[PDB]
Amino acid sequence: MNIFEMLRIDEGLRLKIYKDTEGYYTIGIGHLLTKSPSLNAAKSELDKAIGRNCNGVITKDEAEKLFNQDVDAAVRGILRNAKLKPVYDSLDAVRRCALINMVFQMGETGVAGFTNSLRMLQQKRWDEAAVNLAKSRWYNQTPNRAKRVITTFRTGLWDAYKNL
């Protein structure tokens, strides 16, 4: 299992503009287009993103291309971030993927706000950190996905995704 396979389980694949769990306009493998309410703003962002007139629909190919850009941007953002970088460096390869997953879902900023959990992960207090991560909007809004990520941080194994 790798980061791409993991995110693709969590996000799914949709070739037509769709709404987030959040109500936001998205396409592909969890690629947010706009937080704006107009399908029209969304369509516009889509064509800007792909470089063609898409009419709200993309190919698999284009979906994966956006996916490769998003994952790269997530990793680079972690590495540029003063709060994130140290945690990332301190973790093993599997847990590294769990932080990447959060950053992809919630952005650099959002994850950097989980001050106390970050602190515990750096200290390698896995069980404590898992309990602390669960106390969030994040877990309450998308509990099955949060729980997969959380188990990943707790165990350092890929089991949560085996099932799936």
From Swiss-Prot:
SUPFAM superfamilies xrefs: Lysozyme-like
* Consequence recorded when altering D20 to A/N/S/T: Complete loss of enzymatic activity
Outcome of mutating S117V: 50-fold decrease in enzymatic activity
* Record's catalysed reaction(s): Hydrolysis of (1->4)-beta-linkages between N-acetylmuramic acid and N-acetyl-D-glucosamine residues in a peptidoglycan and between N-acetyl-D-glucosamine residues in chitodextrins
Annotated consequence of substituting S117F? 10-fold decrease in enzymatic activity
Q: Which residues form a coiled coil?
A: none
According to the record, what induces this protein's expression? Expressed late in the viral replication.
- Xref: InterPro entries: Endolysin_T4_type, Glyco_hydro_24, Lysozyme-like_dom_sf, Lysozyme_dom_sf, Phage_lysozyme-like, T4-type_lysozyme
Cell location? Host cytoplasm
Q: Quick one: which residues bind substrate? A: L32, F104, S117, N132
Its Enzyme Commission number(s) read: 3.2.1.17
Give the record's family classification: Belongs to the glycosyl hydrolase 24 family.
Summary of the function given for this chain in its UniProt record: Endolysin with lysozyme activity that degrades host peptidoglycans and participates with the holin and spanin proteins in the sequential events which lead to the programmed host cell lysis releasing the mature viral particles. Once the holin has permeabilized the host cell membrane, the endolysin can reach the periplasm and break down the peptidoglycan layer.
Query: How is this protein named in the record?
Result: Endolysin
Q: Which gene encodes it?
A: E
